[PDB]
Amino acid sequence: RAQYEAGVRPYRETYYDPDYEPKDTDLLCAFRITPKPGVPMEEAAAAVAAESSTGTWTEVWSNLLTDLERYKARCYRIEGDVAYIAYPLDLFEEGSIVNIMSSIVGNVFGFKAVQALRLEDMRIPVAYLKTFPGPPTGIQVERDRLNKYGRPLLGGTIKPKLGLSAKEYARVVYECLRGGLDTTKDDENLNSQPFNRWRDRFLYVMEAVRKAEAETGERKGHWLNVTAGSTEEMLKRAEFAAELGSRYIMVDFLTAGFAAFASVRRRAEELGLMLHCHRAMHAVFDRQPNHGIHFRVLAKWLRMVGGDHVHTGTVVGKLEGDRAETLGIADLLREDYVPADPGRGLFFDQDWAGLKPVFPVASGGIHVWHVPDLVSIFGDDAFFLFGGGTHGHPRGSRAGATANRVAVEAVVQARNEGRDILAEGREILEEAARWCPELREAMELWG
Amino acid sequence: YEAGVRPYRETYYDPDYEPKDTDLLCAFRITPKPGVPMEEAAAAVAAESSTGTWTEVWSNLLTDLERYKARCYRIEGDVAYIAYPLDLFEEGSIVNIMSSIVGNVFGFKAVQALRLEDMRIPVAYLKTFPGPPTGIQVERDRLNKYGRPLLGGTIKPKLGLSAKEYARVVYECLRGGLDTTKDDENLNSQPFNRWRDRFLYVMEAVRKAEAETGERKGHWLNVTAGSTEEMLKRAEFAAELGSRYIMVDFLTAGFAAFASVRRRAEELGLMLHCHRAMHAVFDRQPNHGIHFRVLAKWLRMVGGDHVHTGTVVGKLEGDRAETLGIADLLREDYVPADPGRGLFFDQDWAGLKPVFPVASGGIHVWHVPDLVSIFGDDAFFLFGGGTHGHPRGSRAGATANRVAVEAVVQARNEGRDILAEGREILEEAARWCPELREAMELWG
Amino acid sequence: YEAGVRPYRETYYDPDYEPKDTDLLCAFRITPKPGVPMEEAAAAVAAESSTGTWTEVWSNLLTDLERYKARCYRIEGDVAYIAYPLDLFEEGSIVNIMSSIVGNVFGFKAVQALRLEDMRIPVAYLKTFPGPPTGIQVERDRLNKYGRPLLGGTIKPKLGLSAKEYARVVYECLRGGLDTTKDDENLNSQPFNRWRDRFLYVMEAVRKAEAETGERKGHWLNVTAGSTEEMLKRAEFAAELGSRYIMVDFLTAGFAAFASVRRRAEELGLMLHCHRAMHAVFDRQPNHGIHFRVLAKWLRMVGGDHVHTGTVVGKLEGDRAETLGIADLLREDYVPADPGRGLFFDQDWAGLKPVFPVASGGIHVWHVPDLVSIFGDDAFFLFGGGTHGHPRGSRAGATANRVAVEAVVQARNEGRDILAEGREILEEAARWCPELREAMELWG
Ligand SMILES: O=C(O)[C@@](O)(COP(=O)(O)O)[C@H](O)[C@H](O)COP(=O)(O)O
Ligand SMILES: O=C(O)[C@@](O)(COP(=O)(O)O)[C@H](O)[C@H](O)COP(=O)(O)O
Ligand SMILES: O=C(O)[C@@](O)(COP(=O)(O)O)[C@H](O)[C@H](O)COP(=O)(O)O
Ligand SMILES: [Mg+2]
Ligand SMILES: [Mg+2]
Ligand SMILES: [Mg+2]
Incomplete structure (x- = not known):
């Protein structure tokens, strides 16, 4: 007894500790908080x-059953609008993006105390x-698997978005690949x-x-969309896609969720399939600059759970x-190591612990005129996806x-002679x- | 051909359109860019x-666009109504809807904000x-509890308790x-x-708590994990322990994984409570995201016995x-439209059996009268800190919570006005x- | 390039290097051959x-060697400290460490005698x-025994007893x-x-003993076999019989088979006792082999509820x-370094749960006062020959063993100094x- x-006591007398120094095994989260008027920032x-x-909204008698300073998080520093919070490594399950989220x-x-809250960044410890x-x-x-070096790998999105039949889908696919x-x-x-x-x-x-491979001489592919109602169907379509020779x-890794995405990733590696990830529904999170989750937190989560490609969005x-x-x-x-850059949105450093890189994919309403801006931002190791800029040509796919291949290849070659892309891209494209x-x-x- | 690039207003806008009974209607509260009209x-x-796409494609002529394309049939100044043909969506997949x-x-440059208010799922x-x-x-029937809201509580603190101590806190609450x-x-x-x-x-x-009480008890074991196979392994373990x-956290885990777990859960004869964690990333702001009524529709469609609806107080x-x-x-079974409650459309549930709503949050005994007024008897009340925060243990x-609910319900059944007499009922109890x-x- | 052939010192000896928190530090007890410097x-x-290898190869230039090479950063005259980076070791596998x-x-000619004394496992x-x-x-909690060492005993003779007679000795000891x-x-x-x-x-x-004595008994059935499939067959048969x-002999069976049996034991819900047979060939000599503190670190990581820590007396x-x-x-949970106790490195266990150290050998009642002093309340005291060697049966x-231990621990709990009053306490008992x-x- x-x-x-x-x-009922304020949160800042047991969860705000400005003298704390984060360890190298701590999760560090940067939060862009907007408190309800009257409520102070540090509260x-x-x-x-x-x-x-x-924590919770009251003292509970169970708090004395286990030590609380070993596991409790604490906002160790506030820079006015951004609050930094440190989480112990012991609070999270090993190898699960689900628990870290x-x-x-x-x-x-959804707290009444905070009118709006955004997760700007997060440091994942090497442990x-x-x-x-x-x-x-x-x-x-x-x-190497595609046998393509020194060039931003191309790509298209077969349009119309919906409506085409299987026979008409394959004839358009052959047009783009050829x-x-x-x-x-x-x-x-789809x-x-x-x-x-x-x-x-x-x-x-x-x-x-x-058919296109036997006629062009290069190695092509087609990112079959294996997302479905459940993980079982997602794996069944992955199995069928593998035995077909793809x-x-x-996978729409956000609409399908992260648990299903992790389950598909393991099956995909077992079948020798390079897995492209689509970031659909990300714009619900990362649109408003005052609420939601920034994409770079999701970009960290994707590489953490495994994806060969992902859309980073196109600026232009x-x-x-x-x-x-x-x-x-x-x-x-x-x-592999990303130092913190305040001017580039990063709040923490990132040691990637030997994890292997991911292809950034530029997708959107991009045509040949966006190539000079696309090459400069992303460089050789990226994907350029011309969905409407390929089928929308006045003479077919x-x-x-x-034309898209010529534009990308001419600019990238032009970058090799030292020509300034952002000052001569128009003339480079005109010369091509x-x-x-x-x-x-x-x-x-x-x- | x-x-x-042509304006979107000419093909995907059609105010005179009358939506078929098999269409998928959606309501979007659009906030466009300056210089961009609502119609665009x-x-x-x-x-x-x-x-559609951002330009005109030669492959438009390959099939009939009008058979499949969506279209906006009504704009109420700020909210735009859109009709989706039934042939655009896979049969039974929430993911394709999403x-x-x-x-x-x-995420368009020309749409400064976009909130999906409500959407009507056709019976087909x-x-x-x-x-x-x-x-x-x-x-x-399975719990053998009737005529009153059911009570629950989150074991607290959220993290830190060992398995031995966790089961000791669980026993105190249930007993x-x-x-x-x-x-x-x-956890x-x-x-x-x-x-x-x-x-x-x-x-x-x-x-142990059930035997010493005489009533059926339960504990919503969290089978959420980092993979579908791991969650099915955890669900199977809980099933054969007698749980x-x-x-499952149906939003952080995902919807494909949630559908997979639901199918396995019904095979083992479990009752799958669903937790709506991360929903506030979507439904908090009023100008952007997805309203929870849409996420509440989807959960019932795929299947979930409970769901958190969010206590008002x-x-x-x-x-x-x-x-x-x-x-x-x-x-x-049938939900008619009600602009006061934000229900844009009339929704027929076509025999899909209902879902327990769950009210959880910083609620205590003082919130019992208001909660019973809102949720009636077919709801769960969770007192996480309102049970463990009592000055004498769990x-x-x-x-205290059980007496508070049973007293307020009895007064409501006796004809008293709960909203006005909550304080008096609680004092009398x-x-x-x-x-x-x-x-x-x-x-x- | x-x-x-080039001296090893030029590249792999870096006395100025500062070890990282993610490095794998080892302490090697080196006895160089007559005529070679210790650092070489x-x-x-x-x-x-x-x-590294014995000659400079053309293939070294294909990679950033300095990011992967292990280097010696401190020599204490006869003990050498080597820092192994984290990228060289597969995750979750003890076998790759060894x-x-x-x-x-x-086994190289230059180093005549070499012993691994200790190694630091980074938290990462x-x-x-x-x-x-x-x-x-x-x-x-699984046995419902607290506040005293747990008492066990090997069944003697080692081999020869038939199945019926073997179970008769087990019944006597447990009863x-x-x-x-x-x-x-x-066996x-x-x-x-x-x-x-x-x-x-x-x-x-x-x-039968568990029913008649009122408390929970047990028996560490040996599921060791010549193949992991056979071991798992025996592990499952032991599980469904109620054990x-x-x-498992975790050293003769092998670390891979041990990791496989440990994973299956957790799934089946079986407590896994680990026997360190063949460890002596490793750790007996003071100038060659592997110290058992390294094998104790390796065992706790890969898993195991007990390990024979060895009795001093x-x-x-x-x-x-x-x-x-x-x-x-x-x-x-945390083990600070102590040169007098043989520990070379600070060890952080990162939340991995502890292990019972099991003391067994040629011990009897006269060794109990010293045994309860070294270990305390959390250890197993195995009396193989001290249980059946009693003149009046097992x-x-x-x-006799149960009374001797429970009297000594109860005398310690009231302030008596065990090392000085062991004889007096045992005579009083x-x-x-x-x-x-x-x-x-x-x-x-
Ligand atoms: O759905 C589309 O519109 C696309 O297929 C582009 O088609 P067009 O190239 O014909 O526009 C891309 O998936 C989106 O741009 C995704 O955007 P993000 O990559 O930012 O997720
Ligand atoms: O995590 C918590 O805080 C709770 O356990 C409440 O415990 P207390 O009762 O001790 O606060 C609830 O799960 C959340 O409030 C969910 O809220 P929503 O239903 O809005 O997701
Ligand atoms: O084989 C034996 O001798 C024992 O059964 C003891 O029997 P007695 O109690 O009759 O000696 C033990 O397994 C070893 O002593 C263990 O050696 P370690 O403690 O070195 O693992
Ligand atoms: Mg697309
Ligand atoms: Mg909760
Ligand atoms: Mg033995």
């Missing part, structure tokens, strides 16, 4: 750390980072529709894929983006795919179009 | 969540979903009056509390009128129950 | 357990290991007062006593100073326990 305080910040850790962003977002498998193949194995695009892909909403059933789409396009599968396309923000996200995927008719129509169409 | 923005969402409607259209599409395994009525308890949403498998020890320990407490219940933010609509949207806290007396004089 | 031998062992650290290095690498399935705390018994390390399945019969007969003896325990050798170090290396021998008298006056 032990006795305790049994009251709402302690609320976030309390309810992503052992069930706890950190579970209940802290926690090593319990994760990471990408199956990474960039370097990917390039045109010069290194790869195509299913659209994110799974098993009554007009484009998956068991027929998988069989049809791979005949188109294998090198690729695709038809979807929102920031150039400084994207550059940080690109190096969070492609590099094959003409559009060739002076001898490439397909690029001529594309340049005199979009502008 | 004429190449070139509304057609942008409908086109880009459907057959990856099509709420997948790509939110609804017939391909399994629905909740047990539902409200079968659950009440003290609570019908069920639950693992907290972040999956940690070094201080591994899952194979916690499952075996708290199930011993559940059986009635499991618990607790510590978590949540509206009162909108929560009433959600409670009707999860329990009732057994007293559980008794504390007049003969000390545990409730100490609970009230401590809080509020 | 320059091709040829220290550099040689570092290179031959890492990216393939690198204690592989080819022990340590986290990728499961640890003991149940540990100390959970097991005590007499022991908490567990155990199979002997070399897997022999023509005179097969495992199908031994497992079935023993589990009948355990249950609490299984026993017995027929088996073993120091006293190092024995306290190992017992702390198993049971404590039932009387079990009682013997003046009211006749069984203890005959054990005292036969082995005095």
Whole structure:
């Protein structure tokens, strides 16, 4: 019959500890808090750390059963608007993105105390980072498996988004691949529709894929969308895609969730499939700059659970983006050590513990005119996806795919002579179009 | 075929359209860019969540666009109505609904904000979903508890307790009056509390508490994990220990994994409580995200016996009128439209059995009268800190909450006005129950 | 590149290097051959357990060698410290550590004698290991025994006893007062006593003693076999017969088979006793082999609820100073360095649960006062010959050992100094326990 305080006390007297120094085995989270008026910054910040850790809204008698200072999180520093919170390594399950997200962003977002809250960044310790498998193949194995070096790998998204049948899907796929695009892909909403059933789409396009390979001499592919209602169907389509001879599968890793994505990733590696990830539904999180989760937290989670490719967004396309923000996200995927850059959105350093890099994928309303801006931001090791910029050509997919290939290859070659891309890209493209008719129509169409 | 970018307003906007009974209707509260009209923005969402793209493609002529394309048929100044043909969606997959409607259209340069308010699932599409395994009525029979809201509590602190101590806290709550308890949403498998020890320990407490009480008890074991196979392994372990219940975080785990776990859960004869963690990343702000009524619809479609609806008077933010609509949207067979409660569309549930709503948050005894007013008797009340925060331990806290609920319900059944007489009912009950007396004089 | 043979010192000896928190530090006791400097031998062992070889190869330039090479950073005259980076070792596998650290290095001509004294497991690498399935705390609840050492005993003779007679000795010892018994390390399945019969007969003896004594008994059935498939077949048969325990010779079976049996034991819910047979060939000599503190670290990581820590006062050798170090290396969450206790490095156990250290050998009642002093309340005292060697049988021998330990621990709990009053305490116990008298006056 032990006795305790049994009251209601502020969160900042047991969860705000400015003198704390974070360990190298601690999870560090940067939160962009907006408190309810009257409530102080340092009190709402302690609320976030309390309810992503052992805390609650009252003293409980169970607090004396176990030591609380060993496991409790604590907001160790506040820079006015950004509150830094340190989580012990003992609070998280080994090798599960679900728990690092069930706890950190579970209940802290819907509190009355905080009017709005954003998770700007997060430092994953090397101790926690090593319990994760990471990408199956990474960039370097990917390039060798495709036998393509020194060039941003191309790609298209077969349009119309929905409506095409399996026979008509495969003929468009063959047009893009024969045109010069290194790869195509299913659209994110095309799974098993009554007009484009998956068991027929998988069989049809791979005949188109294998036909284009025998005629061009290069190695092509097609990111079959294997997302489905459940993990069982997701694995069944992964199995069928492998035995058909495909090198690729695709998963909407956010709509399908992270547990299903991790389950598919293990099956995909066992079948020797390079797994492309689509970030659909990410814009619900990372759009508003005052609430949600920044993408670079999801970019860290993807590489942590394993994905050969992912969309980082295009800055100059038809979807929102920031150039400084994207550059940080690109190096969070492609590099091994990422020093903190305040001007590039990063708040912490990142030791990647030998985990292998991820291809950044630029997708959106990008045509030949975006190539000079696309090459500079991403460089050689990236994917350029021309969905509308290939089929939208005034002479079909094959003409559009060739023009896109010429534009990307001319600029990248031009970068080798030291020519300044951001000052001479227009003239470079005009010089290329002076001898490439397909690029001529594309340049005199979009502008 | 004429190449070139054309305004979206000419093809994917159609105000004179009358939606078929088999369409998938959606309501978007669009906030467009300056200089971009609502008509352009509304057609942008409908086109880009459907057959459309950012330009004109030669492959448009290959099939019939009008058969499949979405279209906006009504704009109420700020909210845009969009109709989706039934042939665009896979039969029984929440993921395709998510990856099509709420997948790509939110992150446009020309849409400063976009919130999916409500969407109407046609009966034809609804017939391909399994629905909740047990539902409200079968659950009440299985527990053998009728005519009152069921009580629960989150074992606290959230993390830190060992398996031995966790089962000791669980025993005190269940012995003290609570019908069920639950693992907290972040307690999956940690070094201080591994899952194979916690499952075996708290199930011993559940059986010990049940035998010494005479009532069926339960504990929502958290089978959430980092993979579908791991969760199915954890669900299987809980099943053969004799557990009635499991618990999955249906949003952080995902929807494909949630559907996989639901199918396995019904095979083992479990009752799958669902926790809505991370939902506030979506539904908090009023100008961006997805309203929880849409996420509440989807959960019932795929199947879940419980779901958190959000207590109105607790510590978590949540509206009162909108929560009433959600409670009707999860329990009732037919839900007519009600602009007061934010229900844009009329929803027919086509025989899908209902879902227990769960009210959890910073609630205590003082919130019992208001909670019973809102949720009636077919709901769960969770007192995480309102049980363990009692000045005399969990057994007293559980008794205080149990006495508070049973007293307020009895007065409501006797015809008293709960909203006006809650304080009087609670005082009259504390007049003969000390545990409730100490609970009230401590809080509020 | 320059091709040829080069001294090992030039590249793999870095006295200025500062070890990282993610490095794998080892302490090698080197005895160089007459005519080679100590650092050259220290550099040689570092290179031959890492990216190095005996000649400069053209393929070294293909990689950043300095990111992977192991280097010697401190020499203490005769002990060498080597720092192994984290990238060289596969996660979760003990076998890869021994393939690198204690592989080819022990056999080069330059280093005549080499012993691995201690090694530091970084927290980053340590986290990728499961640890003991149940540990100390959970097991005590599983047996419902607290506040005293747990008493067991090997069944003698080692080999020869038939299945029926073997279960008769087990019944006497358990009925007499022991908490567990155990199979002997070399009794897997022999023509005179097969495992199908031994497992079935023993589990009948355990249950009969468990029912008549009122407390929970057990028996560490040996599931060791020549293949992991056979071991798992025996592990499952022991599990469905109701046994609490299984026993594996974790050194003769091999670390891979041990990791496989440990994973299956946790799934089946079996406590896993580990026997260190063949460890002596490693750790007996003071100038060659592997110290048992390294094998104690390796065991706790890969898993195991018990390990034979060795008794100081017995027929088996073993120091006293190092024995306290190992017992702390198993049971404590953090183990600070102590050069007088043999520990070279600070060890952080990253939440891995502790392990019972088991003391066995040629011990009897006269050794109990010193045994309860070295270990304390958390250890197993195995009386193989001290239980059946009693003149009046094994039932009387079990009682004598049980009384001797429980009297000593109760005398410690009231302030008496055990090392000074062991004889007096044992005589006081013997003046009211006749069984203890005959054990005292036969082995005095
Ligand atoms: O759905 C689409 O619109 C695309 O197929 C582009 O088609 P177009 O190239 O014809 O526009 C891409 O998946 C989105 O841009 C994804 O954006 P993010 O990569 O930022 O997720
Ligand atoms: O984690 C918690 O805080 C709780 O256990 C409440 O325990 P207390 O009762 O001790 O606060 C609930 O799961 C969340 O509040 C969920 O809220 P929502 O239903 O809005 O997700
Ligand atoms: O084989 C034996 O001798 C024992 O059964 C003891 O029997 P007695 O009690 O009759 O000696 C033990 O297994 C060893 O002593 C263990 O050696 P270590 O402690 O070195 O692992
Ligand atoms: Mg797309
Ligand atoms: Mg909770
Ligand atoms: Mg032996």
